[PDB]
């Protein structure tokens with residue numbers, strides 16, 4: 001009669017990490033990739049013999065900086081002249097070229113110089129997320145919901161759809177990331193009456209606050225605010241500068257000119273930063289860091305909190321601006337939702353809870369997974385084709 005339909009997937013196509021989910025048996029499954037990771041780096045690397053995507057691309061970035069592409073989402077749907085693009089190019093080791101006032105990334109790949117549009121790089125990340133899902137389901141996947149930031153314009157939204165089409169996906173809908181995080185908590189299923197929801201999204205490189213109103217399951221974006229120069233990488237930089245100084249005091253040596261030693265220090269700092277979200281202290285143990293000297297040290301959560309104190313407090317400025325723009329008082333916010341791995345930081349949670357007079361934060365869905373979770377919930381709703389009973 002009618003063959004069973006394949007499940008549709010929800011993709012969070014992130015600037016630094018991407019995540020894929022599927023709603024089945026009344027629940028969302030966030031799908032781990034073949035290395036057991038529930039999030040996949042939005043990285044694509046090019047060599048003489050291969051194109052690597054995700055963890056394989058991110059793991060070889062140190063020795064292949066010119067041909068490993070990341071941050072394509074900062075270029076998608078933008079003009080080459082755009083001041084955002086020009087400033088961002090100074091921080092990237094890969095080449096960004098001008099093709100008819102449209103940016104393209106230029107690399108060495110399989111013996112040739114090749115240039116790609118940002119939507120083509122994003123399509124490679126989407127092909128990997130589709131394959132992660134088909135490895136779990138055991139059949140080909142066709143349908144997907146893809147999320148974007150609420151501030152994305154029409155051109156940025158159309159380029160995202162174009163990336164989906166290149167990847168062989170049927171894009172059911174492009175939905176806003178804060179709307180997807182709200183859907184994950186079922187905040188559109190609470191019945192009649194208006195609800196004001198604040199989404200607090202602290203990423204690897206940027207911070208976004210959104211205020212949404214939800215009335216009978218209808219979403220309206222009331223205000224957006226944030227900080228483009230505030231994210232997880234800034235907290236990693238503070239630990240790096242702290243340990244460089246510490247090595248100087250202890251061994252009278254400046255390591256800051258050996259890229260390998262700095263990179264090994266930063267990698268260790270990022271992991272110590274993650275440990276400090278669950279423990280009150282963390283160890284840093286690097287062998288032969290510089291001039292055959294082993295660096296075996298520690299850092300308390302209190303010292304880390306002091307090192308990043310100004311950065312953590314600055315997350316409250318866009319919160320107050322968003323509340324002024326939405327014309328709301330903090331007491332009028334019904335729900336607070338956390339998005340991004342950096343929101344696991346206990347001090348970040350405490351500052352925000354204190355700002356909203358002890359209110360509970362929705363953090364039960366892994367903050368790095370909430371956007372894909374809501375996108376998977378929406379994807380299952382969009383493919384329903386029920387015919388009314390008499």
Ligand SMILES: Nc1ncnc2c1nc(Br)n2[C@@H]1O[C@H](CO)[C@@H](O)[C@H]1O
Nearest residue numbers: 016203204232233274277341342344
């Ligand atoms: N448990 C965690 N505690 C503190 N930070 C974290 C955690 N998990 C993740 Br993931 N991060 C950071 O989130 C950002 C995502 O792009 C990166 O800067 C990660 O280091």
Ligand SMILES: [Mg+2]
Nearest residue numbers: 014177203371
């Ligand atoms: Mg995100």
